Design a protein around this ligand. Sequence first.
Ligand SMILES: CC(=O)O[C@H]1C(=O)[C@@]2(C)[C@H]([C@H](OC(=O)c3ccccc3)[C@]3(O)C[C@H](OC(=O)[C@H](O)[C@@H](NC(=O)c4ccccc4)c4ccccc4)C(C)=C1C3(C)C)[C@]1(OC(C)=O)CO[C@@H]1C[C@@H]2O
Ligand SMILES: Nc1nc2c(ncn2[C@@H]2O[C@H](COP(=O)(O)OP(=O)(O)OP(=O)(O)O)[C@@H](O)[C@H]2O)c(=O)[nH]1
Ligand SMILES: Nc1nc2c(ncn2[C@@H]2O[C@H](COP(=O)(O)OP(=O)(O)O)[C@@H](O)[C@H]2O)c(=O)[nH]1
Ligand SMILES: Nc1ncnc2c1ncn2[C@@H]1O[C@H](COP(=O)(O)OP(=O)(O)O)[C@@H](O)[C@H]1O
Ligand SMILES: [Mg+2]
Ligand SMILES: [Mg+2]
Lengths: 426, 412, 330
Amino acid sequence: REIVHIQAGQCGNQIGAKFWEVISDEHGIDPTGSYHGDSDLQLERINVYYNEAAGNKYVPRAILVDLEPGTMDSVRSGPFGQIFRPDNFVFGQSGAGNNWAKGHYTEGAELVDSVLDVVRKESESCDCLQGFQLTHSLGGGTGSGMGTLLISKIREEYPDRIMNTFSVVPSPKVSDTVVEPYNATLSVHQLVENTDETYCIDNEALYDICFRTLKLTTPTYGDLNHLVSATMSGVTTCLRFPGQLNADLRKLAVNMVPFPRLHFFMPGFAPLTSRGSQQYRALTVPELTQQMFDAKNMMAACDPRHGRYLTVAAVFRGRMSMKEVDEQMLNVQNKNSSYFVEWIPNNVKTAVCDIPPRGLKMSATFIGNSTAIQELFKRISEQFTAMFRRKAFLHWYTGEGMDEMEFTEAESNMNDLVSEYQQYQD
Amino acid sequence: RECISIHVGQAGVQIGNACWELYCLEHGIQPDGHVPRAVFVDLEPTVIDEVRTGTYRQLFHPEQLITGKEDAANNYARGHYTIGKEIIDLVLDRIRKLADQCTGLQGFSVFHSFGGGTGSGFTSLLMERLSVDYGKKSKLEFSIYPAPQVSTAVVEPYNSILTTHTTLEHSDCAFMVDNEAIYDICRRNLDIERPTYTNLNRLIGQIVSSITASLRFDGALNVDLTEFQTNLVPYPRAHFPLATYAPVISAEKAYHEQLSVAEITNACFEPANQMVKCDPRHGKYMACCLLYRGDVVPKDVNAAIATIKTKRTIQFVDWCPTGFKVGINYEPPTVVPGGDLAKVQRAVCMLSNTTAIAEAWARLDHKFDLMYAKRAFVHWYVGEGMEEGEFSEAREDMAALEKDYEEVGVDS
Amino acid sequence: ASVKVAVRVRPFNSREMSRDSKCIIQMSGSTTTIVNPKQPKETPKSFSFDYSYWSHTSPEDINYASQKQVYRDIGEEMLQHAFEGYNVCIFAYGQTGAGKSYTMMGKQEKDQQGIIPQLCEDLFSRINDTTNDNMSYSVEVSYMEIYCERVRDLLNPKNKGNLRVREHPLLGPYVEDLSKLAVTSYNDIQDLMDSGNKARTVAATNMNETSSRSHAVFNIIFTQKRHDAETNITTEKVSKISLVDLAGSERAKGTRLKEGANINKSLTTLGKVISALAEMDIPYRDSVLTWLLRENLGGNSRTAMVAALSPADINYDETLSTLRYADRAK
Ligand SMILES: CC(=O)O[C@H]1C(=O)[C@@]2(C)[C@H]([C@H](OC(=O)c3ccccc3)[C@]3(O)C[C@H](OC(=O)[C@H](O)[C@@H](NC(=O)c4ccccc4)c4ccccc4)C(C)=C1C3(C)C)[C@]1(OC(C)=O)CO[C@@H]1C[C@@H]2O
Ligand SMILES: Nc1nc2c(ncn2[C@@H]2O[C@H](COP(=O)(O)OP(=O)(O)OP(=O)(O)O)[C@@H](O)[C@H]2O)c(=O)[nH]1
Ligand SMILES: Nc1nc2c(ncn2[C@@H]2O[C@H](COP(=O)(O)OP(=O)(O)O)[C@@H](O)[C@H]2O)c(=O)[nH]1
Ligand SMILES: Nc1ncnc2c1ncn2[C@@H]1O[C@H](COP(=O)(O)OP(=O)(O)O)[C@@H](O)[C@H]1O
Ligand SMILES: [Mg+2]
Ligand SMILES: [Mg+2]
C-alpha cells in the first residue's frame, strides 16, 4: 500500500519538516542517505512514504505547496531539507497574502495545475495507492485556501483513495492571526466535504500538554510540531507495520466514521512523560489508557469530558497482551458509560502493532471521534459572525474576486456541521 | 479421507499458523519436511507475509498463500462483494487444484474470524462457492465469533450478522471458539494476565488438533468428519457447536496432572472451561461429541459419561435420548515444548450444540440493531455494492435463528 | 401527510414473457404481498402503504390502476399543496424496467400520460379557469439529468458541458447556467416535455445508458401574484414543484464503481431524508440530488414516492428490496 503526504502552506510545511524529521528516524533514512535502520523491519513497508531511484536514496513522496518562497527556502535550506526531490517544491513566488481567497481563487488557483501535475506523478508512482496525508493551518492563505483546494481537486481525481487531514484549527485564547475565523470557516467547509479523516490540533492545547505534561518551560514551535508529528506517525506509518491486530487508514476510517460528514478526530499520544525524572516506566498499559483517555492530553482544544464519543481508536504499537489491551478498553468503556454514546456497543477500536516508537518500550496513538469537537466549530463559527456581521476585513477577500454569498455558505455549512454533531451527543 | 482447510482473514491465518504448528509438532515433521494441505487468504498482504517471513516459512507453497495487496477493510460488503470478489476465483482455483490432487476427500476445514472484513465477507462467498461446487462433502467451518463485551472492530456485528446469514445455508457444522471466553481460561485455568494472541491460537490450536489431526488418525473409536455433522447437527441450519478442552492445566503452577478420566470429563461441562461465553445459562445440550485422546479405557468413559447422563442439572434436550458420541483416539495430546500448556497423558475435546447459543446469537443480534437503527457505518457498505436489502434481509435471517435455537429446545 | 408512499406493479414485460415468469405479487386494499418463487408453500411477506396500485393487467380490466387514478390520488393533492404556497416532491423509485418513467411521464398517446403531463395540464387548466383580475401567475420550468454528480440540461440540446450544483451563500443550491423557461400554456410546456423526454433517449445516451443511470428532475417554479384593490399592491407566493424519475435502484453487474457509488449514495441519502421527514410528523449535502432538492424536502414541504414493482418471479430480490425501501420511507 501507499500514501503521498501534502505540506500545504507554511505551517503545514513547517510541520512537514517535523513529520519527516521523525518518520525518517522511525525508518532509518538519513538526510539523503538510505536505510541505516537499526532493524530490518523498518524497510519492508517503507514504500508507503518513499520511492526507489538510486539505491540509497529513498525520497519522501510528499508535496510542498506554498506561495511564500522564504518558507520552503528555510525547510529546504536546513536539516533534512535536502531529501525532497526539487520536483516536490510547488512554490508560488506570488504574494502569499494571508487571504483564504488569495490562495484559493486568485493566486493559488494558478499554481494548482502545476501541483496536481505532480500529485499525479507521485500517485502513479507504483503499486497501489491508499490515500494522501495533508498538513496545514486553517488560519491563513496558503494553508486553508490553497490547501483546501488541493484536496477538492484530489477528491475528484481519486474518490477511491482516502484523505487524512491534519488541521491546525485556530486556537482559542489567542489567535496567531486576525481574520483567522475567515480563513478557517472557509477551509473547514471544504474539509467537511472532501477529506474523510481529519486530525485537528491546537497550538495551545499543545502548549498546555507540552508545558504541564512535559515540564518543558520553553516549548518552541519545533516542539509542538514535533509532538504532533509523533501522533501522525503512530497513525499511518505505524499500522503499516505488523501486529497481532493491525489496521490501516481504512479500518481506522471504516471504524471511526459513523456518518459521512467525514468527522474530525482529536489525536493523543501515549507515553508523554517529562525526560529524566518522570521516566517512571509506568507503562504496563493501564498507564497508557490512563493517559490517552484523560482530558488534558487531547491535542484538541475541547475536552472529551464535555461530550460523548462515537468512536475511538487506540492504535497501540509495542508488545502487549491482547488481553490486557482488550480488557482495559472495557472497564474504560464502563467507568465512563456516561460519555461514550450508547448506540454503539463497542465504540472503541483496539488496534495493535508490534514494534514501538524506536526508542520507547510501549506507546499507543489515540484517535478520538468525540462529539466534544462541537464546542470548537462553535467557537470558530462564533468569531466569524461577530466579525462577518460588520464585514470586518472582508474587502481583502472580495477585492480578490470572492462572493458575499461564499462566506455565507461556509459558515452555514460548517455551522450546520456543529448542529449534526449534537444529534449524537443526545 | 482427507479434509482441506482454508484459513481466511488475518486471524484465521494467525490461528492457522498456530493450528498448523501444533500439527507437525506431533507428527515429527520439522520446519522443512512434507507438504501441507490447505490455503491462506487475506486482502492485507502484510499478514500472510508473516507466514512468508516468520516460522513455518518453507513448509508452504507460495501457491497456497493467496493475497490481495489491495485493501482489507473491516467491512463485510467490501470484502464479500467489491474487493473480495476479485480474488475468489483464484482462491477457489487452489481449493479445486488442491482438492483434485488428493484421493477421495471428505471436506474443507475453514478457518475464519466472524467479525472481520476478509474473514466475514470473503469466506461468505468462498463457502458460498463451495456449497455449490462440492455440495457432496463436509463444510465444517471453525469460527472465532465476537467477544461478548470485548469486541474490537466498531462494526463487528455488521460483519458477523452478515457472515452468519450467508454461510448458514452453506456450512455443515460450524465450530465456535469465543476469543474472550478463552481469556478467562488463561486467567482462571492457567493463570496469566499476559496472554498474547499467540496463545489463544495455541489453544484453539489444541482443540482443533483433537478434531482433525488425531481423529483422522487411527484409534479405538474413530470418528470421521461426516460423523460429526451427523452425530452433531439435528437440523440443516449449519448449526454451531462449541469447542471445549479438558486438561487445560498450567505447566508450571499446579500439578495434579494425573487426573483420571472421571475428572477430565467432568471438567468439560463446568462452564468455566469452554472457549465460549455461552455459559450453559439454560441451553440444553442436544448432542456432544466427546473426543478423547491418550490412555483411556472405554469403560472408564462408558461410565464417566453414565455418571453425567444422570446429573440432571446438565439437562439434555427432550427429543434426545442419548446424545453422546464417544470418540477415542490413542496418541495422547502434544503440548508446545515450552508454552504454558500442562502436558497430560489424556484429554477431552468435547464439542456440542447447546440451546445456549440462543443467548450468544441474541446478544450479538441486538448489537447490530442498535447501530443499524441509526445506519451507523452503513454508508461504508452501500458504497461497496450492498443495499438496505442485504442488511435488513440478513437481520430477518438470524431472527429465525433466534427462534430456531429456541424451538428445537425449551419445549417438549 | 407530509410523506405519502405508494407502490405500483406493472404487467409482464418482454424479458418476463420470454422467461415464462409467474406473478409473485398480489394486492388487496393498501396491502401488497410478495411470494418467494423458491418457497411457494409459504405465506407471502406483507407490506402496507398509503396505496398499493394493481396495474398488472390493463385498462380493459375493471380493477386496473390507471394513470388517471394514480394522478388523482397522489398528483392532484400535491398540486393543491402548491396552490397553497408550499413546495412538493414526487419521486418514482425502483428497478430499471419496473415502471418509473411510465408512471412519471408515461406515453405520448391517449390515456397513457403520467403524473408530470397530467399535473401540468391540471395546473394550466386551473390557472386559465381562475376568474379574478387580482390573480395573475407565472410558470417556469427546468428539466435536467443528474449523472455522476453532474447536471445535464434536457431543454438545451447543446448543453455545452456539465453544469455544477452550487450553494448560493443565502438563497440555496442551484444549477449554474441551467435554463429556466417561462411557459404560458400547456401545449407549450408539453412541447418542452416532449423535447426533454426526447433528449433522454437519443442514441448517444446508450453510451452510458443515462436513461436508467441518471436521475431526471422536472422542476416547476409556480408564482401566484395577488393584487389588492384597497391598498394597491401585489403579494407573491412561490411554490416549487419537483417531479423526479430516479436512477434504477438496482444499480445502487456491469455497473462502473463510481456510477454505482453515486447512485447508491443518492438513493440511500434520499431514503434517510424521507424517513426523517416522516419522523418529524438531515444530511442533504450527502448527495447532489438531495442537496439540490433540500428546499422541497424541508419540514414545510410535502413528498410522495411511487415505487415501481416488477410482477415476475425472476425479480424477487430487487422487488423485495424496493418494497423494503418504500416501507422505510414510512
Ligand atoms: C533516554 C530515553 O529513553 O529518552 C526518551 C525520553 O526521555 C521521553 C521523555 C520522550 C522524549 O520526547 C520529548 O521530549 C518530546 C519533545 C518534543 C515533543 C514531544 C516529545 C524524546 O525526546 C523522544 C524519543 O522518542 C523516540 O525515540 C520515538 O521513536 C519518537 N521519536 C521522535 O519523536 C523523534 C525525535 C527526534 C528525531 C526523530 C524522531 C516517535 C514517537 C512516535 C512515532 C514515531 C517516533 C524518546 C523515547 C526519548 C527522547 C529522545 C528524550 C517522550 O516523547 C516521545 C515522543 O517518546 C516525551 O514523553 C515521552 C517519554 C520518553 O521516555
Ligand atoms: N483467537 C484469535 N482471535 C483473533 C486473532 N486475531 C484476531 N482475532 C479476533 O478476530 C477479530 C479480528 O478480525 P480482524 O483481524 O480485524 O480482521 P480479519 O478478519 O483478519 O479481516 P479484515 O477485517 O479484512 O482485516 C477480532 O474479534 C479479534 O479479537 C488471533 O490470532 N486469535
Ligand atoms: N503547530 C504549529 N502551528 C503553526 C506553525 N506555523 C504557523 N502555525 C500556526 O498557523 C497559523 C497561521 O497560518 P500560517 O501557517 O502562517 O498560514 P500560511 O502560511 O499563509 O498558509 C497560526 O494559528 C499559527 O499558530 C508551526 O510550525 N507549528
Ligand atoms: N402500468 C403500466 N401499464 C402499461 N405499461 C407499463 C406499465 N408500467 C410499465 N409499463 C411498460 O414497461 C416498461 C418499463 O417502464 P419504464 O420503461 O417506465 O422503466 P423504468 O421503471 O425503468 O423507468 C415500458 O415499456 C412501459 O411501457
Ligand atoms: Mg487482516
Ligand atoms: Mg425510465
